[PDB]
């Protein structure tokens, strides 16, 4: 099944490879290879984001 996570707060990347997002955004989860940094997709963009900034969605 495809699992989505929803953004609790705005995240502004401090480094390259990180996924920017606004509160409300629904991110497709690609993986949780790092308990703190999950990798995902938001439309065309892809990158890692902090797991504490999101909650399950779908």
């Amino acid at each position: 099944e495809t699992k989505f996570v929803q953004a609790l707060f705005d995240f502004n990347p401090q480094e390259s490879g990180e996924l920017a997002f606004k509160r409300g955004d629904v991110i497709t989860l690609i993986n949780k290879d790092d308990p703190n940094w999950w990798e995902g997709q938001l439309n065309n963009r892809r990158g890692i984001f902090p797991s504490n900034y999101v909650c399950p969605y779908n």
Binding site: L8, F9, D10, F11, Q14, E15, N36, W37, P50, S51, N52, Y53
Partner: peptide, 7 residues
């Protein structure tokens, strides 16, 4: 927003 996890 909480601090960003150990980068």
């Amino acid at each position: 927003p909480p601090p960003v996890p150990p980068r």
